């Protein structure tokens, strides 16, 4: 019955003592942290506490969106040699770092994801030609569905794939997706593999990546400029922001201390130096 | 009144009993006792395999040695029990399964010996690899050493053999082999075998995963990390040694999807 925004217990008055009750002395080897308050070691006063842990609840700690990726698409001229650029991006929280580490304070989590889509666009060729406001379609291609090969193939028809139609110059695009995990919670660390290499099988036939599984395959996001070829090329970037609302977490882990190196837990040489210099006898 | 103490303990699982006189109580991970899979939480339809005493008893691994230059030691579960009597057999023949464990590490010395050992149970102890060229590159064989387990190192060594890479872990001790300061390791259920006080560490771990049951052959749910927090010294000698031993016992052992024998390539 203790809510997140409720006041923490008041610190009460305590005078002098001298007996056989031992608050100060314990043993950490047992694995238990001594749950002491100030009155156990010092003489304190009656104090009506007012502060609350309202701002540190799991909900509140993650109550923010974070740039997860930056996608790049364009609309060049018809006379072009290289094909119009369409972006494909696999849905992961692990391309960026900030959000990842927060998520990584825990081993498992349940949340409904809210995604926002900020879109930028610019001219690239130093000309004086013109472009007409663009519309961008962000289709969600789940694992299994056909992933576009052309900016103009049959996939972009979207009969069952969720797709967003964003007009440039308006409110950034935002959708919601429920807990879509194949497991009962999203796993942030997997201590295993996908395949089991068997004795009577070729090593090649039995290999898989360490810590890699379907637990994390959510398909890709495909985007293009709906507009047809324009005489003067226009570049555009869609910045995606993920907010894990309605969140639940399990098993606390120490936070990443060394800069990340790939989607795994691996680290590289010369990055393994997080702490600076500080002498033992100085403040 | 009767002299009952938290240092003196005896635990019994099956036809095996552990006894000690220098304990520091006992830890039950996250306050949860191991349990059987509930109907409300179940998923595979087939009637499950509950081996009981058959698999659920204490199992002693191969003893290792603690000296001044040891950097640490590690093991994974179930992995570290893969070849232990019935449990292992029951593991190799069923597609899925779940289990808890009571891990008991042993290491006594003298009132003249000193040192502290951090015994940490890390759910999903995904260790770091040895290559700076390719990530998540450690092979199954090297990942799962089984009962012998593995060790931590004090210096990162990137494999530069691009022809036939080593494909193993290179777990740096201070980063608890995962890229996170060992100092925070205490966030995980743990105990400290500080020679002065205690000779053992006992931790009870329930089954922990993102799902009710999983393929124990493909996935390790808990890791066992033991690192000397304080160094091992005795009197005034230069190279002292004290053995460390781990006995592990599954708890509430159950398995489903019985089929033919799994013969994995371990080497």
């Amino acid at each position, epitope marked *: 019955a203790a809510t997140s925004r409720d006041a923490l217990p008041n610190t009460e008055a305590s005078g002098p003592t001298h007996s056989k009750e031992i608050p100060a002395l314990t043993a950490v080897e047992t694995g238990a942290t001594n749950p002491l308050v100030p009155s156990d070691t010092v003489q304190t006063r009656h104090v009506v506490q007012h502060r609350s842990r309202s701002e540190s609840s799991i909900e509140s700690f993650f109550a923010r969106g974070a740039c997860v990726t930056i996608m790049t698409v364009d609309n060049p001229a018809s006379t072009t040699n290289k*094909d119009k650029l369409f972006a*494909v991006w*696999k849905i*992961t929280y692990k391309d960026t770092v900030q959000l990842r580490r927060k998520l990584e304070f825990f081993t498992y989590s349940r949340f409904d994801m809210e995604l926002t889509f900020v879109v930028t666009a610019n001219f690239t060729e130093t000309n004086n030609g013109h472009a007409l406001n663009q519309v961008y379609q962000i289709m969600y291609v789940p*694992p*299994g569905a*056909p*992933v576009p*090969e*052309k900016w103009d193939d049959y996939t972009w028809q979207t009969s069952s794939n969720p797709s967003i139609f964003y007009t440039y110059g308006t409110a950034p695009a935002r959708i919601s997706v429920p807990y879509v995990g194949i497991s009962n919670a999203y796993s942030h660390f997997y201590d295993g593999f996908s395949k089991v290499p068997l004795k009577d099988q*070729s090593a*090649a*036939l039995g*290999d*898989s*990546l360490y810590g*890699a599984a379907s637990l994390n*395959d959510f*398909g*890709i996001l495909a985007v293009r400029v709906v507009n047809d070829h324009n005489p003067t090329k226009v570049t555009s970037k869609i910045r995606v922001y993920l907010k894990p609302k309605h969140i639940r977490v399990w098993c606390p882990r120490p936070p990443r201390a060394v800069a990340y190196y*790939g*989607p*795994g837990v691996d680290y590289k040489d010369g990055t393994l130096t997080p702490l600076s210099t500080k002498d033992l006898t100085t403040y | 009144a009767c002299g009952y103490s938290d240092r003196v303990l005896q635990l019994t699982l099956g036809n095996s009993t552990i006894t000690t006189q220098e304990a520091a109580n006992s830890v039950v991970a996250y306050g949860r006792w191991p349990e059987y899979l509930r109907d409300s939480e179940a998923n595979p339809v087939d009637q499950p395999t509950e081996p009981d005493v058959a698999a659920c008893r204490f199992y002693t691994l191969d003893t290792v040695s603690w000296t001044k230059e040891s950097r640490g030691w590690w093991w994974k579960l179930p992995d570290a029990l893969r070849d232990m009597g019935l449990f292992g057999q029951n593991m190799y023949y069923h597609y899925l399964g779940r289990s808890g464990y009571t891990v008991h590490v042993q290491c006594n010395a003298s009132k003249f010996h000193q040192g502290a050992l951090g015994v940490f149970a890390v759910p999903e102890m995904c260790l770091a690899g040895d290559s700076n060229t*390719t*990530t*998540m*590159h450690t092979s199954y064989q090297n990942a799962n050493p089984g009962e012998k387990g593995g060790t931590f190192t004090g210096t990162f060594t990137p494999d530069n053999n*691009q*022809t036939s890479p080593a494909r193993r872990f290179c777990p740096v001790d201070y980063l608890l082999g995962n890229g996170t300061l060992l100092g925070n390791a205490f966030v995980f259920p743990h105990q400290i075998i500080n020679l002065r006080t205690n000779n053992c560490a006992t931790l009870v771990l329930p089954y922990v995963n993102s799902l009710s049951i999983d393929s124990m052959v493909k996935h390790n749910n808990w890791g066992i990390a033991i690192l000397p927090l304080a160094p091992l010294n005795f009197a005034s000698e230069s190279s002292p040694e004290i053995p460390i031993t781990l006995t592990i016992a599954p708890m509430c052992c159950e398995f489903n999807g019985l089929r033919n024998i799994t013969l994995p390539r371990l080497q």
Partner: nanobody
Amino acid sequence: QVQLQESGGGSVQTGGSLRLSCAASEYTQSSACMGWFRQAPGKEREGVAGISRFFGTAYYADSVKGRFTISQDKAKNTVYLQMNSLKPEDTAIYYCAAGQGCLTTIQALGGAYGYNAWGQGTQVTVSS
């Protein structure tokens, strides 16, 4: 699966050009870097070439760089492999390799590990 169907078994002499192709028409989580593996009956199976599904991440085995190149048709869907200046040391059975979720060939970059759909096999002999 995807479709993987390969051909091109021409026993050319030492120093000739050969082209290998593998179908990848259906679009599953499509062959990322793709993959080309040769099995020398003296040795075993080994990875060789590979260009990312969309991106220009093409990895080349130490033994084949420059001479062997990978490229495909992002439409006609088939994967080409230009193998020129052929040594007699490259006489082996080649195979194409679908590495699905692109990250499979981004993490490890090279194939082998993230590869689920296996090709048929074409015998290439480069002799005197």
